[PDB]
Design a protein around this ligand. Sequence first.
Ligand SMILES: Cc1cc2nc3c(=O)[nH]c(=O)nc-3n(C[C@H](O)[C@H](O)[C@H](O)COP(=O)(O)OP(=O)(O)OC[C@H]3O[C@@H](n4cnc5c(N)ncnc54)[C@H](O)[C@@H]3O)c2cc1C
Ligand SMILES: Cc1cc2nc3c(=O)[nH]c(=O)nc-3n(C[C@H](O)[C@H](O)[C@H](O)COP(=O)(O)OP(=O)(O)OC[C@H]3O[C@@H](n4cnc5c(N)ncnc54)[C@H](O)[C@@H]3O)c2cc1C
Ligand SMILES: CCCCCCCCCCC1=C(C)C(=O)C(OC)=C(OC)C1=O
Ligand SMILES: CCCCCCCCCCC1=C(C)C(=O)C(OC)=C(OC)C1=O
Ligand SMILES: [S]
Ligand SMILES: [S]
Lengths: 421, 421
Amino acid sequence: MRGSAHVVILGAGTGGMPAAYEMKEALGSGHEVTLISANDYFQFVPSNPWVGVGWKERDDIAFPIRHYVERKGIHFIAQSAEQIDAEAQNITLADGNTVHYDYLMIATGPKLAFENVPGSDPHEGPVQSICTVDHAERAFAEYQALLREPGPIVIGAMAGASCFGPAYEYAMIVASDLKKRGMRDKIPSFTFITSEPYIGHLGIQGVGDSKGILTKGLKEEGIEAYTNCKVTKVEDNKMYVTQVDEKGETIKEMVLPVKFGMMIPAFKGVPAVAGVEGLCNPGGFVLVDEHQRSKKYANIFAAGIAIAIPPVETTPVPTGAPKTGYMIESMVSAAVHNIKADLEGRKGEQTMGTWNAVCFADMGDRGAAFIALPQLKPRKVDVFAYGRWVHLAKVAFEKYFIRKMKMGVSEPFYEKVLFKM
Amino acid sequence: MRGSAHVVILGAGTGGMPAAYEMKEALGSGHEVTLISANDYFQFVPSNPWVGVGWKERDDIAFPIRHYVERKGIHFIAQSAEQIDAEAQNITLADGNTVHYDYLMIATGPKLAFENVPGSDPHEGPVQSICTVDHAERAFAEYQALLREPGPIVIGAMAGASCFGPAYEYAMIVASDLKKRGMRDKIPSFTFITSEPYIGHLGIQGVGDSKGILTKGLKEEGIEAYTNCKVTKVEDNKMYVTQVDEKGETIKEMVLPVKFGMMIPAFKGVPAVAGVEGLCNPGGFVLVDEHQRSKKYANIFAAGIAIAIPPVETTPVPTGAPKTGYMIESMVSAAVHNIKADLEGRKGEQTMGTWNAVCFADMGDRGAAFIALPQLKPRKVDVFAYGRWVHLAKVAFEKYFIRKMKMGVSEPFYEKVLFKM
Ligand SMILES: Cc1cc2nc3c(=O)[nH]c(=O)nc-3n(C[C@H](O)[C@H](O)[C@H](O)COP(=O)(O)OP(=O)(O)OC[C@H]3O[C@@H](n4cnc5c(N)ncnc54)[C@H](O)[C@@H]3O)c2cc1C
Ligand SMILES: Cc1cc2nc3c(=O)[nH]c(=O)nc-3n(C[C@H](O)[C@H](O)[C@H](O)COP(=O)(O)OP(=O)(O)OC[C@H]3O[C@@H](n4cnc5c(N)ncnc54)[C@H](O)[C@@H]3O)c2cc1C
Ligand SMILES: CCCCCCCCCCC1=C(C)C(=O)C(OC)=C(OC)C1=O
Ligand SMILES: CCCCCCCCCCC1=C(C)C(=O)C(OC)=C(OC)C1=O
Ligand SMILES: [S]
Ligand SMILES: [S]
């Protein structure tokens, strides 16, 4: 309200949950901060691949949100937004209630566009997914069912995907698990299918020796890999694959039977956000400026996977670049600062900073991780590392982040640099 | 003097030059800051290997100090200290003059202990060195003489060495240069001799896949490599090598003829510092606490290669761990803060922080670099990277640091992190 702005954060994920705490800390008791999310629980998404192979469980990586944000003075609504009226500044919830805002920060993450590939929805066939804890459990359940009746395996990433690390990770840990149970030899064909133009492109034109290391890894595990692939449909428990050349021409079509499958889908913007006239690009991603502010609506900000970031290359089969945790947090931090500035008469000048991608993939005792920045080459940092110390860092970070999400974030978040100081 | 403390910095190198600027900035016009050094010029030491192969020249990497520090109010004495009387707080210079201090910060770097291996001094035989710009020129001169009368090459690192990166670097660029001139095939034997227990140990128990990458690199260039080696003497243009086993027992003795050679020597503390009773360990390195303060003299601080750091392993052939640039700068920053604190009644609490090693080795179009921390495994960061982007960073950093040494340093030096912000 006038003189007491009401700020709403839409989505309680990697970006949204920190956004709620930070917003409240920034604004204080004089302003209302409301967090709205489809689920009543936070999940640490980088852990989902492990849930999907049964190496972690839901209660290790998820917890109920209400108590933690409420004790900070944050209002929590465990309801999905179905409609956003940018003109009246009203959000319509699933239960038909409306919530008014003075400022809105959209942190809704990805819509999993299973509809791009008929039959690829985890509920429509054998092709599962590990992006959400709900789906990773379903993935594991199916994995258990492959244990009973072994058959062909197909793991990978669909056309349009932007999140490739997890595909490599899932394929490696499945291989690893097939052995620790002792049943790898029961598989007629383990196949990696990706829209990447080459192994380890990762949607970022490769990083360090990602190609050689990942290529060698898949071979070591007896996994046959195909690049430049798009799945046209999943039907009758068969995946129909078209492989193309550098110019898009078909070089082969394949019909792969699937007993157990997992393909990372393409991401789009969620429907409530995509549905706002003039807010988004055609993929449903919010068009924002360097300050995280909507180009159309001055009182709408956005952060996380939800924002649009222009491509910098165009691959034979459509692919996207990932939006990862450190950059997401920088976007959140910028949006919070600049909303505060708005409430006080100034144009916030804070930006998300240099584009970067960071990803940690834990294999069990050793992990691989990459750091790349900026987006285009030649980069200032282009590192792909492998070692047990990567595994140890992933373990350490998940523990940290989950704790921070329960205890609150002030904060110039990552002073996770004082492993130096 | 009383109420107006006189601070002396001994040595104008990677640690000492920044120390002078920072000290002066910290203290201001009310205190005298004197910088004393053996040479009247600063040299960027990581560039010396390239000087040693003729890929850089002295005037690209060195410049006269006087004007730059004097215009900051810093007094500069281009004289070597020969004696330090810790009790009277008097430094005796080469010309017999004495300089009194209230606080002394020792930044004298390494004494190159060529005397450990009879005949290994660059002026005594064919075994040269690239640690100083003076010696790297002499190295190149000899390289030019091998071009005229080709013969056996031996590059590597002596027992007791702590600086291995440069040995690998020099060996690779020499190979590279032998080809760009087209004369590699004229060499009867190119041999890498190291005190490391294995290739890529680097005095730090390896980092990432340093072993595999360096091993492969030496093979690619047609260089035969021997580990666990100590050179007993260089004589008659022959290097006498003893190779040992895990327990120190001789497993072979070798006599290698050398037309052109380069071995990184062991480092000790310089004589003026080692000569101070009770100041140093037996190697002549200053014993300091976490605050960079001498354990014996409260008004003596130290930074850089000059300080003692306890070993954490004991290798078949004696080796040391390197002291590198970022950690050196942290030591300098700590010493400055804590001297200032002393001048104002408090115990400075600032430390050098977590032990770390960083090293960049430029091969020409691509470079290798490593980052390791902390000292013992399992580490929080254990990365060894290779790529043209490493070369680009080395180029960028040398330009930066040289500029900073002419323009002055405030400073919380490395905010060379805003390639993020
Ligand atoms: C399998 C996987 C592994 C990954 N691993 C890493 C990694 O190791 N490192 C890294 O840096 N990044 C990783 N990422 C990427 C990125 O960090 C995560 O995707 C991160 O969770 C994205 O943050 P976000 O806040 O944009 O979206 P999310 O975390 O997905 O949160 C969006 C929130 O909005 C909610 N929401 C959606 N629609 C509505 C609606 N209409 N109304 C109300 N709420 C709604 C959702 O329920 C969700 O809570 C990984 C991603 C995936 C999929
Ligand atoms: C070949 C080589 C390559 C290296 N590459 C890297 C790298 O890539 N990255 C990295 O982080 N580190 C690197 N290092 C290591 C380290 O960063 C350098 O050795 C650095 O120069 C050490 O800093 P320092 O201040 O301790 O000593 P120095 O830079 O050696 O300075 C000591 C100064 O004290 C002076 N001095 C000595 N005795 C006296 C005396 N009695 N009186 C007056 N003055 C005296 C010397 O003339 C010198 O100016 C490299 C080292 C070497 C040898
Ligand atoms: C040099 C650029 C910054 C280095 C990155 C910081 C180290 C931690 C990894 C990043 C990360 C973030 C931020 C993160 O938010 C996240 O969760 C989604 C991860 O998955 C575990 C991450 O790996
Ligand atoms: C994560 C730990 C810190 C990262 C290091 C910063 C990046 C620059 C490299 C370090 C370096 C320093 C500090 C440095 O002082 C120096 O000169 C002696 C180098 O040689 C070129 C260096 O490579
Ligand atoms: S998913
Ligand atoms: S040297």
